[PDB]
Design an enzyme around this catalytic site. Structure first.
Site, mmCIF file in Angstrom:
data_model
loop_
_atom_site.group_PDB
_atom_site.id
_atom_site.type_symbol
_atom_site.label_atom_id
_atom_site.label_comp_id
_atom_site.label_asym_id
_atom_site.label_seq_id
_atom_site.Cartn_x
_atom_site.Cartn_y
_atom_site.Cartn_z
ATOM 1 N N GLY B 10 -29.564 32.719 -52.617
ATOM 2 C CA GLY B 10 -28.369 32.256 -53.091
ATOM 3 C C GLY B 10 -28.283 31.090 -54.250
ATOM 4 O O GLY B 10 -29.225 31.105 -54.907
ATOM 5 N N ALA B 91 -21.034 36.808 -50.731
ATOM 6 C CA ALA B 91 -20.485 36.936 -49.316
ATOM 7 C C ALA B 91 -19.342 35.923 -49.159
ATOM 8 O O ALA B 91 -19.193 35.968 -47.909
ATOM 9 C CB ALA B 91 -21.949 36.371 -48.633
ATOM 10 N N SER B 132 -29.141 27.569 -48.964
ATOM 11 C CA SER B 132 -28.188 26.614 -48.406
ATOM 12 C C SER B 132 -27.954 26.777 -47.007
ATOM 13 O O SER B 132 -28.148 28.238 -46.680
ATOM 14 C CB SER B 132 -26.974 26.451 -49.252
ATOM 15 O OG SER B 132 -26.390 27.770 -49.396
ATOM 16 N N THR B 137 -24.455 33.635 -48.779
ATOM 17 C CA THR B 137 -25.691 34.206 -48.983
ATOM 18 C C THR B 137 -26.755 33.295 -48.628
ATOM 19 O O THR B 137 -27.420 34.016 -47.412
ATOM 20 C CB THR B 137 -25.854 34.544 -50.707
ATOM 21 O OG1 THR B 137 -24.619 35.168 -51.191
ATOM 22 C CG2 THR B 137 -27.092 35.213 -50.967
ATOM 23 N N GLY B 138 -26.661 32.158 -48.877
ATOM 24 C CA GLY B 138 -27.574 31.313 -48.163
ATOM 25 C C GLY B 138 -27.798 31.152 -46.902
ATOM 26 O O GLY B 138 -28.888 31.172 -46.214
ATOM 27 N N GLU B 175 -18.570 25.874 -43.701
ATOM 28 C CA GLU B 175 -20.036 25.546 -43.839
ATOM 29 C C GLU B 175 -20.443 25.335 -42.534
ATOM 30 O O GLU B 175 -21.651 25.724 -42.300
ATOM 31 C CB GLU B 175 -20.377 24.634 -44.935
ATOM 32 C CG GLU B 175 -20.353 25.096 -46.411
ATOM 33 C CD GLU B 175 -20.656 24.002 -47.520
ATOM 34 O OE1 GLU B 175 -20.422 24.593 -48.778
ATOM 35 O OE2 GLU B 175 -20.916 22.861 -47.244
ATOM 36 N N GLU B 246 -52.118 23.943 -41.544
ATOM 37 C CA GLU B 246 -52.206 22.653 -41.395
ATOM 38 C C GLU B 246 -50.974 21.886 -41.189
ATOM 39 O O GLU B 246 -50.872 20.996 -40.362
ATOM 40 C CB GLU B 246 -53.063 22.033 -42.472
ATOM 41 C CG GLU B 246 -54.524 22.434 -42.638
ATOM 42 C CD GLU B 246 -55.352 21.519 -43.673
ATOM 43 O OE1 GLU B 246 -55.620 22.004 -44.658
ATOM 44 O OE2 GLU B 246 -55.709 20.450 -42.994
HETATM 45 N N1 LIG Z 1 -28.639 20.496 -54.067
HETATM 46 C C1 LIG Z 1 -27.934 21.709 -54.397
HETATM 47 N N2 LIG Z 1 -26.918 22.324 -53.669
HETATM 48 C C2 LIG Z 1 -26.223 23.302 -54.028
HETATM 49 C C3 LIG Z 1 -26.492 23.900 -55.271
HETATM 50 N N3 LIG Z 1 -25.644 24.878 -55.322
HETATM 51 C C4 LIG Z 1 -25.060 24.934 -54.434
HETATM 52 N N4 LIG Z 1 -25.222 24.045 -53.418
HETATM 53 C C5 LIG Z 1 -24.787 23.904 -52.119
HETATM 54 O O1 LIG Z 1 -25.181 25.001 -51.385
HETATM 55 C C6 LIG Z 1 -23.663 25.231 -50.669
HETATM 56 C C7 LIG Z 1 -23.004 26.396 -51.494
HETATM 57 O O2 LIG Z 1 -23.348 27.509 -51.215
HETATM 58 P P1 LIG Z 1 -23.907 28.608 -52.164
HETATM 59 O O3 LIG Z 1 -25.670 28.282 -52.275
HETATM 60 O O4 LIG Z 1 -23.256 28.160 -53.945
HETATM 61 O O5 LIG Z 1 -23.395 29.874 -51.736
HETATM 62 P P2 LIG Z 1 -24.309 31.018 -51.880
HETATM 63 O O6 LIG Z 1 -25.618 30.901 -51.326
HETATM 64 O O7 LIG Z 1 -24.471 31.592 -53.422
HETATM 65 O O8 LIG Z 1 -23.371 32.245 -50.847
HETATM 66 P P3 LIG Z 1 -21.931 33.102 -51.423
HETATM 67 O O9 LIG Z 1 -20.850 32.586 -50.461
HETATM 68 O O10 LIG Z 1 -22.210 34.471 -51.281
HETATM 69 O O11 LIG Z 1 -21.633 32.707 -52.897
HETATM 70 C C8 LIG Z 1 -23.078 23.876 -50.538
HETATM 71 O O12 LIG Z 1 -23.366 23.066 -49.658
HETATM 72 C C9 LIG Z 1 -23.200 23.380 -52.248
HETATM 73 O O13 LIG Z 1 -22.821 22.061 -52.272
HETATM 74 C C10 LIG Z 1 -27.406 23.468 -56.105
HETATM 75 O O14 LIG Z 1 -27.841 23.827 -57.188
HETATM 76 N N5 LIG Z 1 -28.221 22.208 -55.694
HETATM 77 MG MG LIG Z 2 -22.985 32.244 -54.524
#
Ligand SMILES: Nc1nc2c(ncn2[C@@H]2O[C@H](COP(=O)(O)OP(=O)(O)OP(=O)(O)O)[C@@H](O)[C@H]2O)c(=O)[nH]1
Ligand SMILES: [Mg+2]
Ligand SMILES: Nc1nc2c(ncn2[C@@H]2O[C@H](COP(=O)(O)CP(=O)(O)OP(=O)(O)O)[C@@H](O)[C@H]2O)c(=O)[nH]1
Ligand SMILES: Nc1nc2c(ncn2[C@@H]2O[C@H](COP(=O)(O)CP(=O)(O)OP(=O)(O)O)[C@@H](O)[C@H]2O)c(=O)[nH]1
Ligand SMILES: Nc1nc2c(ncn2[C@@H]2O[C@H](COP(=O)(O)OP(=O)(O)OP(=O)(O)O)[C@@H](O)[C@H]2O)c(=O)[nH]1
Ligand SMILES: [Mg+2]
Ligand SMILES: [Mg+2]
Ligand SMILES: [Mg+2]
Lengths: 432, 432, 135, 431, 437
Positions: B10, B91, B132, B137-138, B175, B246
């Site tokens: 993601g 997603a 995330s 996706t995350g 979220e 470990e």
């Molecule tokens: N620390 C950090 N958090 C991030 C970053 N990009 C997104 N986030 C956080 O991660 C979440 C955003 O979801 P994304 O990772 O952008 O979503 P995705 O994994 O691309 O999933 P999709 O809905 O399909 O786009 C929120 O909590 C954001 O604030 C980053 O570069 N650094």
């Molecule tokens: Mg995304």
């Protein structure tokens, strides 16, 4: 009874092992190239016990260096006496046991094992009269503990008629590398009780306390503790590596120290206690040397000998001193402390005097005692194990490797039984 | 051998990946083309016949935007096209799409590339998964990947870097749904997972680095420094190293309780000049103050079960043992009754490297504490409540059901969270 | 007050004799084979058989330990294998249940729009009875 | 998620549609010949969302122009951006529905529908990653209302996996004397509830009131109201038309705004409210923008948000401004007015900042709110419908086309149910 | 020509052997190469030394050890030329201070080899008297191997005299906690196979060195040089043309009244330090009185607490019968010297003219006359009693027993051995009582 096959397993094993090798090499007049440069025929008289004589002038330790983690191999080779060891005798795996006794005993260790046994076989078949084996290792980790105990079992099978001697280092929360030490230690003790003939119980709780309390070292390091270990190892092996009447081989030592097969856990002692920095100090007399046998402050195992009774004791004096004085002092101590020696084992305290002192001291004394007080070290490990096991804490790492809760229950039971046995003889009266 | 495979999933995972790999390159002297004029860096980089070094990593995203920047950016030459995987449609911040609808289209493709990276491994330790909790996706794709990895690679170590959601930077109302569904689906598949709360990072940037409005660039540069401290023990050969096994052994007491708290120190703004240099004692104590934590929670109120301390730079073991001793004397810092000693230490020679034009100042020494405290239950509790508020009214649920998910799946996920919460309680109860 | 000397033997390197201070107080008086070599051998070989026996017994126990070692190594193989088997069937049943639900969701959503078409044409029939059956 | 297929149905649809097209073309640097002449790479970064490149250094709106009346085809071509559209896309009948939803939905409109679907298919299959559809239309007429709802239904069948977005203009007696509008509107809402994912409720009552009260225009014209519409449309699509994290595609916007499927009618808001060809100067401050944008005076739907509660809110700020200030102001508004935001949808207010301001303003703010207060707009249409239906007034206009009184009874019921649902969540407590 | 074959088993036996043979050589004028300048010339020396074709003299002796260390010194030492390689036998691994390991495990490997050379040497004999066996009670070779050897010797040489020189254990010089076990186990096995056995209590020798020789910390060298003197005094009449104990049969006839009570007590005088101011040599009276002083005894016991059943006085050097009879007369007046009902109260007295010899550079001073009294007294029972008690203390708890059982021994053997000691103790009691009639 000539040659001894020395084995070092894990970080601790290899750390203490290297230190022993540099200490005894100096005593025997051997520099790191294996070349003899001493000036006493006494140094070479029994050199064959620990060294194989190599092509030309040179001498090579009969040592096998073992670890599942490759790093320690380089750590040794980089050491002062690193280039003294046979390159072939370095048997190192690719991934450590990760502080898990199950991994070193059943999974990742069962590999390295055979390849290690081939090195011991090569050394063993080369012997004119193999005495047996001497293993150095810790009970806290996964390699020294888990794999070391697997080695002892595989060696025992191949060589059932040989003496199995270990320098087993006991874990302490006061100086620890893993949260799982009570599991690893308990499982190891169970194996030691069944498969060894003589074990030196080197306790890290005892060494920390010596460095902190006596030596006044605010923050003790493994260097500070290994200074005490090397001293002790040098002392307990004096009778083996120099000519003399008393406990000159591993079996004659076992016969004088072990009255009951399972009760083979020795409480090593040493005087004077010195720090790596205590580069002074000129002192110590024969009564001064002798008084330290009951001084719990001088024990390499964390138990008070005054809390129990001696089954058997071996005492080794080093440096130029009157044997009359030594014999007098030795009698005075036993006659005045008759309540700490079992009445049913007459003349259970044997004494030897080596003219050659260790480096740094002009006079020293080493004590090897089979005391019932050793139950305190096992009770400590047991309570620590219970604290964890009661809650099945960290257990999944063990069971994951294929072990059962039953094996844990069985290891603890044997340790409780071992303590229960020492207690039995502690109470035992020489009356009909 | 002993190689780690990093998977960046993601937008959050890919962007942290960019920070991490940029920092690794600087720390190892690898140029953005893969060239470099230790040896342990090979656990993270494959070497080609051209003498170029390629990250043992895969970048997956269901949308091309973010990965398209990687492939046009400074490091486009570092990664092979085949390891940068992208779909066409994301997603839509919906777990159900990342897991079923959209994810199914690219799953086999990703596992193929993973199977190929695993093929170049002579002793795979495991996987490092970056994602995330919040995104579709995350959340959804990661859980689908974890499940597939358990099938293809059985019990092989799988570790996560999960970004805990902060409303300050949150882009989706759903979220908490995505967070709970993913935690539930992943739970049994992950061995250990390091959570990074976005509000904690945001606040450290604001406070310690004087950043008025922190950006993902600011957040990722800080996250990258912690991730590097965690991987340094694998990429370098220091005074003390900790492997993937470990970590699990010393930080995870029970399979479900696998969420250590990360704390890094020192965090200094690249201005000042008088702000240094902090002692081993100063930096250690800082690990116990909440202002330096990666997840917002109060350990004063919880109990520790394990503590791992990863030192880097000008750090001596004697200084570390001195520092731990002082913590072991602090009543305010409680440990559970089933833990005789809950510490694990690592020491690397390399001081932390900084990205030129960065926010962080150069320090002679730093530390990252990984601690398993019952206080982390506070982070689940906040997310669980937000879930409850929405689920009671079934708000947004139709988006999930529409993608083929069942309502009963939400209850399973929440019931498992209710059980996780109860497990943190049970474990702190110290106890007969 | 009285002694008796009885000369016994005289030779090159010396002489011997018996001295009697007092005669005996009392005057009137106060063998088991062999052993056989076969008996020695019997006892020697009985011990050899008790020694060889306890060494064998010991070796049998070290053999039991190895058989157990294979068993725990076997358990760990069966656990990693059963894990793979749970994970495979679980993830498949979830993928099948979802495809199922998801397809049905469209089946009804198009079926509702198909009713719309059925009713639209139906409305055109009601207009037919009015439109030109008119004026 | 790249391309959007834009459709304009009826006079209103085409009027507002042309206006959107000229507004966004200027923002993107596209002159009426389709040629790009701007000076920012940001303008073209996401141009593909609304425009097709097509063989030639020029850009062509992915728009389909529809009506059953032929006149509007010429009215648009004569307009400033008339020569920008694809000539093939202009689908125009000869009739004109005569404010009969039945004619638009069943009779005259069904005849043109297939010819329209002909053009959408061509546009759609040409897309690499179709987001979905955007329809502009009124609910008060026959074509936009009737045919527009038939279109949605037919496009829904062919593309069931795509987002259906509409800009639906609500009738008012203030702007139109047409008596049947409540029927047409009610019949349309029924269709919107079932067949759309996101609908912007542009209320002519609200626009008339803005022009008359605020703007002080004695007699407001469709030109005056459309000025407010174009402003609003430009604002709500900013996140779609320019790079950014928040609500960047139609689906991610629907996921953040729609908690319950039927409650997908958005109340749009704009600040500052201006009249046509009017240069202030004096751009609003950040607290000014935040407050104004949350007033009932600033709503494009005729309801007081203070009369209800926000389920979800999206706020877009345009121009050069400190994001700190924006975030601060945005928090201040939702911490002080906690009684207007549902407690059971945590962090339901999302905010975005686009550096590119709209033409005419140096600083602006757009508000997209899913408020329960929208029930007031539906209650108004419903009361108007009942007033008529109770007396069966004009019913033969529709029954004549083949419709039944039940089709009516059913449309009303669904609207009463819709209001009844907003009320349910308005009262709904967190606990 | 009536030959005697000496056998030395284990470290103690081999080292005393070295002292004995060094002293015999000096007493007969044989150089360490075996060459004896017979150039100007009683032949009795041949009962202990074979002659070669080269004219060299070879000890009728065998040295056995289950370990090579001690015998390896013999084969590189001063007398390496005196002994033939074949008569110096060694194993590779010792009996680890364990009777079982010596008798059962390791012993069996070298037994046939040992008997073979004994056979060889038993041939070059034109009238074999028997054997002189030297061994420690304490060690695993001296205990375990000796008892195994004694048994086979009885088979191969049916009713041929076998005499022991056994080293009784002292804690001062003791190297093993298990010496009482090995002592009792060997005594039991050997009992029926030995005809007469002279025990040498290490504490007695240790104390005589300390007192008379002024040695602060006595060494095995000091102990053995002393032991040798007594051993030489005993064997003198076999190696020279004597008149008393002129054959081994005579020892047994003269000192052993019953087969089991075959442990005579030895007392030697004078023992004087060589490094002291010149002194007016001791009279026959002075040296005789010294025989009835426990401070000069070879085994620590009190003959006041006992009764004599046979007494023998072996005078060496400048000794006249008139002076001996005068000395015996004086003793009777002042001291009781109780005998048993059955024996006459008296002494069998032999003078050997060959003067006492000392190792030059030694601890002992050269004397014009000396004496060794051999006496069978019930008081020797005290030495068994001390050992029996130490055995009892350990056996009650079975301490160390596993070491023995592990080498194939049975726990019943310890009971058998101790029951036989209990019987030996009772036999010393029974023999000291009044006779009936
Ligand atoms: N620390 C950090 N958090 C991030 C970053 N990009 C997104 N986030 C956080 O991660 C979440 C955003 O979801 P994304 O990772 O952008 O979503 P995705 O994994 O691309 O999933 P999709 O809905 O399909 O786009 C929120 O909590 C954001 O604030 C980053 O570069 N650094
Ligand atoms: Mg995304
Ligand atoms: N006296 C000493 N104890 C040590 C030393 N190194 C470690 N240890 C102790 O040993 C235990 C930890 O063990 P190790 O380093 O030996 C573990 P090992 O390397 O054998 O196995 P792994 O699990 O594969 O790491 C523990 O009680 C430490 O506290 C040392 O150098 N000296
Ligand atoms: N804000 C605006 N509302 C408009 C505009 N034109 C009409 N309308 C409104 O829309 C409804 C009347 O509809 P139209 O012109 O769109 C009818 P349409 O042409 O779709 O169909 P027909 O019935 O075939 O004429 C009503 O509420 C008018 O008041 C306009 O330009 N702007
Ligand atoms: N007088 C004297 N006593 C000795 C001598 N050597 C050993 N001893 C004593 O004999 C006992 C030990 O027996 P050893 O003969 O040394 O052992 P061994 O016969 O070789 O049997 P192993 O255990 O197989 O070595 C102890 O009482 C020692 O003090 C010696 O040379 N002179
Ligand atoms: Mg290690
Ligand atoms: Mg019209
Ligand atoms: Mg010996």
């Amino acid at each position: 009874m000539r040659e001894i096959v020395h084995i070092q397993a894990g970080q601790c094993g290899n750390q203490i092992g290297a230190k022993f090798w540099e200490v005894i090499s100096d005593e025997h007049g051997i520099d790191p190239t294996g070349s003899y440069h001493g000036d006493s025929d006494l140094q070479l008289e029994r050199i064959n016990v620990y060294y194989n004589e190599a092509t030309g002038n040179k001498y090579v330790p009969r040592a096998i260096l073992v670890d599942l983690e490759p790093g320690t191999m380089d750590s040794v080779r980089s050491g002062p006496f690193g280039q003294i060891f046979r390159p072939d005798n370095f048997v190192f795996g690719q991934s450590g046991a990760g502080n898990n006794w199950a991994k070193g005993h059943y999974t990742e260790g069962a590999e390295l094992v055979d390849s290690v046994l081939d090195v011991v076989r090569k050394e063993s078949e080369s012997c004119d009269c193999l005495q047996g084996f001497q293993l150095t290792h810790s009970l806290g980790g996964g390699t020294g503990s888990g794999m070391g105990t697997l080695l002892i079992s595989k060696i025992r099978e191949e060589y059932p008629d040989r003496i199995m001697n270990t320098f087993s280092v006991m874990p302490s929360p006061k100086v620890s590398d893993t949260v799982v030490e009570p599991y690893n230690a308990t499982l190891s003790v169970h194996q030691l009780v069944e498969n060894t003939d003589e074990t030196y119980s080197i306790d890290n709780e005892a060494l920390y306390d010596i460095c902190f309390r006596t030596l006044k070292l605010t923050t003790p390091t493994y260097g500070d503790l290994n200074h005490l270990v090397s001293a002790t190892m040098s002392g307990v092996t004096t009778c083996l590596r120099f000519p003399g009447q008393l406990n000159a081989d591993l079996r004659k030592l076992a016969v004088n120290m072990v009255p009951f097969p399972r009760l083979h856990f020795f409480m090593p002692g040493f005087a004077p206690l010195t720090s790596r920095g205590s580069q002074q100090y000129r002192a110590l007399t024969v009564p001064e040397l002798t008084q330290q046998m009951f001084d719990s402050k001088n024990m390499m195992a964390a138990c008070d000998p005054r809390h129990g009774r001696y089954l058997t004791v071996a005492t080794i004096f080093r440096g130029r001193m009157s044997m009359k004085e030594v014999d007098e002092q030795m009698l005075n101590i036993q006659n005045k402390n008759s309540s700490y020696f079992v009445e049913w084992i007459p003349n259970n305290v044997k004494t030897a005097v080596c003219d050659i002192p260790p480096r740094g001291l002009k006079m020293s004394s080493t004590f090897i005692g089979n005391s019932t007080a050793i139950q305190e070290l096992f009770k400590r490990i047991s309570e620590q194990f219970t604290a964890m096991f009661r809650r099945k804490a960290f257990l999944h790492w063990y069971t994951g490797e294929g072990m059962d809760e039953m094996e844990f229950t069985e290891a603890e039971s044997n340790m409780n039984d071992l303590v229960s046995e020492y207690q039995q003889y502690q109470d035992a009266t020489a009356d009909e | 051998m002993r190689e780690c495979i990093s998977i960046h999933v993601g937008q959050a995972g890919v962007q942290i990946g960019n920070a991490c790999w940029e920092l690794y390159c600087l720390e190892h002297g690898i140029q953005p083309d893969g060239q470099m004029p230790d040896d342990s860096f090979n656990t993270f980089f494959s070497e080609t016949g051209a003498g170029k070094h390629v990250p043992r990593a895969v970048f997956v995203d269901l949308e091309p935007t973010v990965i398209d920047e990687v492939r046009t950016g400074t490091y486009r030459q570092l990664f092979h096209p085949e390891q940068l995987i992208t779909g066409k449609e994301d997603a839509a911040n919906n777990y159900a799409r990342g897991h079923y609808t959209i994810g199914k289209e690219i799953i086999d493709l990703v596992l193929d590339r993973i199977r190929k990276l695993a093929d170049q491994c002579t002793g795979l330790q495991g996987f490092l998964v970056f994602h995330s909790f919040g995104g579709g996706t995350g959340s959804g794709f990661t859980s689908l990947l974890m499940e597939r990895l358990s099938v293809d690679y059985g019990k092989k170590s799988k570790l996560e870097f999960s970004i805990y959601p902060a409303p300050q930077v949150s882009t989706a109302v759903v979220e908490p749904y995505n967070s709970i569904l993913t935690t539930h689906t992943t739970l049994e598949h992950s061995d250990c997972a390091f959570m990074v709360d976005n509000e904690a990072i945001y606040d450290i940037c604001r406070r310690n680095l004087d950043i008025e409005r922190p950006t993902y660039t600011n957040l990722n540069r800080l996250i990258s420094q912690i991730v590097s401290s965690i991987t340094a023990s694998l990429r370098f050969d220091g005074a003390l190293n900790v492997d993937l096994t470990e970590f699990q052994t010393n930080l995870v007491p029970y399979p479900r309780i696998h969420f250590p708290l990360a704390t890094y120190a020192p965090v200094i703004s690249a201005e000042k000049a008088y702000h240094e240099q902090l002692s081993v004692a100063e930096i250690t104590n800082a690990c116990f103050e909440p202002a330096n934590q990666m997840v917002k929670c109060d350990p004063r109120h919880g109990k520790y079960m394990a503590c791992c301390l990863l030192y880097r730079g000008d750090v001596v073991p004697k200084d570390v043992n001195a520092a731990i001793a002082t913590i072991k004397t602090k009543r305010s810092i409680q440990f559970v009754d089933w833990c005789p000693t809950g510490f694990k230490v690592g020491i690397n020679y390399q001081p932390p490297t900084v990205v030129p034009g960065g926010d962080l100042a150069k320090v002679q020494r730093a530390v990252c504490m990984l601690s398993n405290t019952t206080a982390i239950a506070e982070a689940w509790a906040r997310l669980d409540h937000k879930f409850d508020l929405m689920y009671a009214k079934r708000a947004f649920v139709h988006w999930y059901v529409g993608e083929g998910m069942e309502e009963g799946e939400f209850s399973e996920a929440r019931e498992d969270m209710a059980a996780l919460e109860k497990d943190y309680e049970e474990v702190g109860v110290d106890s007969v | 007050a009285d002694m008796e000397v009885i000369e016994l033997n005289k030779a090159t390197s010396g002489q011997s004799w018996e001295v009697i201070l007092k005669p005996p107080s009392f005057d009137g008086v106060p063998r088991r084979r062999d052993p056989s070599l076969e008996e020695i051998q019997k006892k020697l070989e009985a011990a050899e058989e008790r020694r060889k026996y306890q060494e064998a017994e010991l070796l049998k126990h070290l053999a039991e330990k190895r058989e157990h070692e294979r068993e725990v190594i076997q358990k760990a193989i069966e656990e990693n294998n059963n894990f793979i088997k749970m994970a495979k069937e679980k993830l498949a049943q979830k993928m099948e249940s979802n495809k199922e639900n998801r397809e049905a969701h469209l089946a009804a959503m198009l079926e509702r729009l198909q009713e719309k078409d059925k009713h639209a044409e139906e409305v055109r029939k009601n207009k037919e009875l009015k439109e030109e059956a008119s004026r």
